[PDB]
């Protein structure tokens, strides 16, 4: 497949941010619930 170059190229810095924001969006909320599991059962 052939393609033009990126119209709005995403640099390594921009990628690193993207990937970090992505991972933290999955990890932080699940972690919050899980880290506090005991405060829910002990109740």
């Amino acid at each position: 497949i052939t393609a033009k170059p990126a119209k709005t190229p995403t640099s390594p810095k921009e990628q690193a941010i993207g990937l970090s924001v992505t991972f933290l969006s999955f990890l932080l909320p699940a972690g919050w619930v899980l880290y506090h599991l005991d405060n829910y059962k002990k109740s």
Binding site: I1, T2, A3, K4, P5, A6, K7, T8, P9, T10, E14, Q15, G18, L19, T22, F23, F26, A30, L34, L37, K41
Partner: protein, 514 residues
């Protein structure tokens, strides 16, 4: 315009796009559930501390993955996008009914997610067998909400099936015969026939489960002369066809992918592939009681159902060898999609072979309701269906979007996911032979090592799902527009550019009758 376009669609491409979004999301819901399962089992003892909650998580996991991720992505998404493009049709036969097939899923899904929120959830398993599913052991609205969710999804898929069949039969070019349609179109046509005949029997069954819970019928309650075994028969009469429904669009997608990236103009043994899918379809109807090999049915019956289940391997084998024959002498291009497709071929074969083991009712006594069964279907379903979905998604993404994915990232993604799913499910074969039951929140101490490894595996695959989310973002963020596509002479889906216009084939194709 937003409403008119997206809530009020009569366009197969946008409807397809709605399905893919809904599917991707429910996939996230399902994925979370799956990790909760493996958190609980990742070291010995308890984590949740409520075990009904665990059976709720297990039950929701399967319903989400089957009805709300796999079916909508493969039939609703790929099916609506691709089928009209491959037979040169302007849209589906019934474009407005088609929108309702879609808008039934969110409410179908709302009812299921509601069922976990009210009372103590529906912790029955995805089989929902009474009496555990009945009005004493599961008093309250959770099971009834689960039942209605399934009604809405089955109506969605029944109406969808009528649309696909009518379209594929009636809306080809006049000259084109059915044996001139691509294999993916065939795979959807046969999957729709299966849905049409199976989903109503389920509806009958779970309606009789609903009347038992709320109108004092006793279809399945021995107090009234009922029999809980009747529910099992009706459920699995649908349930076995359902598993073949879940893989058949994958078989097609794979045939397209292996062919494309071999640089072939067609797959090997086209008519053999049509034959194999029809035979699988047919035999898929006469094997259901292999799910009931421990309920105490007659030995002659158990003998028929073992023998009949085994034949299915013949036409399945034809496909496997036909795909390898397609690779024979290919100018093989190592795209991500080709890697997903090769993954499928091997991991499905393994999954299928453990299927043959279980077909033996002698052995099934010892393997039934163990982790051997869980390992079987996670190979054949979750490294079959999912691998096919991933290969399809990367192959055809530039057609849908107009942008390209980053091939290197896509390959890192395959490699991470490949390790994780094998690390998760492979050891479970051992858990099963050694006697660990399914649907257990905690195990005897012996089973610790494999359960620990299995659970670490689940985490690796989580990293793949997260990375895929990034991958999509990067493609949309960068905007590398497609220019040129290979092998268009034999791949009509591509022939209208990327993305193809709102209305395509306003003027039909030209095809001669000779």
């Amino acid at each position: 315009m937003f409403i008119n376009r997206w809530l009020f669609s009569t366009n197969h491409k946008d409807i397809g796009t709605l399905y893919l979004l809904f599917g991707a999301w429910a996939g996230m819901v399902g994925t979370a559930l799956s990790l909760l399962i493996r958190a609980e089992l990742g070291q010995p003892g308890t984590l949740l501390g409520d075990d009904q909650i665990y059976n709720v998580v297990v039950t929701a996991h399967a319903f989400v993955m089957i009805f709300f991720m796999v079916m909508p992505i493969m039939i609703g998404g790929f099916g609506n996008w691709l089928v009209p493009l491959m037979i040169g049709a302007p849209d589906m036969a019934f474009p407005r009914m088609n929108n309702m097939s879609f808008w039934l899923l969110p409410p179908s899904f709302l009812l299921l997610l509601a069922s976990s929120m009210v009372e103590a959830g529906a912790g029955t398993g995805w089989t929902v067998y009474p009496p555990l599913a009945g009005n004493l052991a599961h008093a309250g609205a959770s099971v009834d909400l689960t039942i209605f969710s399934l009604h809405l999804a089955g109506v969605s898929s029944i109406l969808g099936a009528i649309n696909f069949i009518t379209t594929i039969i009636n809306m080809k070019p006049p000259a084109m015969s059915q044996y001139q349609t691509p294999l993916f179109v065939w795979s959807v046509m046969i999957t729709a026939v299966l849905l049409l005949l199976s989903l109503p029997v389920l509806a009958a069954g779970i309606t009789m489960l609903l009347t038992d819970r709320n109108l004092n019928t006793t279809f399945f309650d021995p107090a009234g002369g009922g029999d809980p075994i009747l529910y099992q028969h009706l459920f699995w009469f649908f349930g076995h066809p359902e598993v073949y429904i879940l893989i058949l669009p994958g078989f097609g997608m794979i045939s397209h992918i292996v062919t494309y990236y071999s640089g072939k103009k067609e797959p090997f043994g086209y008519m053999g592939m049509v034959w194999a899918m029809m035979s699988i379809g047919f035999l898929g109807f006469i094997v259901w009681a292999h799910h009931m090999f421990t309920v105490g049915m007659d030995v002659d019956t158990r003998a028929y159902f073992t023998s009949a289940t085994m034949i299915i391997a013949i036409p399945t084998g034809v496909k496997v060898f036909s795909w390898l024959a397609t690779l024979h002498g290919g100018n093989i291009k190592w795209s991500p999609a080709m890697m997903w497709a090769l993954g499928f071929i091997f991991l499905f074969t393994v999954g299928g072979l453990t299927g043959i083991v279980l077909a033996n009712s002698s052995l099934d006594i010892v393997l039934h309701d163990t982790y051997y069964v869980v390992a079987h279907f996670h190979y054949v379903l979750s490294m079959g269906a999912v691998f096919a979905i991933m290969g399809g998604f990367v192959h055809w993404f530039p057609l849908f979007s107009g942008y390209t994915l980053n091939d290197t990232w896509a390959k890192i993604h395959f490699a991470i996911m490949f390790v994780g799913v094998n690390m998760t499910f492979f050891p479970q074969h051992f858990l099963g032979l050694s006697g660990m039951p399914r649907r257990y929140s905690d195990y005897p101490d012996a089973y610790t090592m494999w359960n620990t490894i299995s659970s670490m595996g689940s985490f690796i695959s989580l990293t793949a799902v997260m990375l895929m989310v990034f991958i999509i973002w990067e493609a949309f963020a960068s905007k590398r527009e497609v220019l040129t596509v290979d092998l268009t002479t034999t791949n009509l889906e591509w022939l209208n550019g990327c993305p193809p216009p709102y209305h395509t084939f306003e003027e039909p194709t030209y095809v001669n009758l000779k």
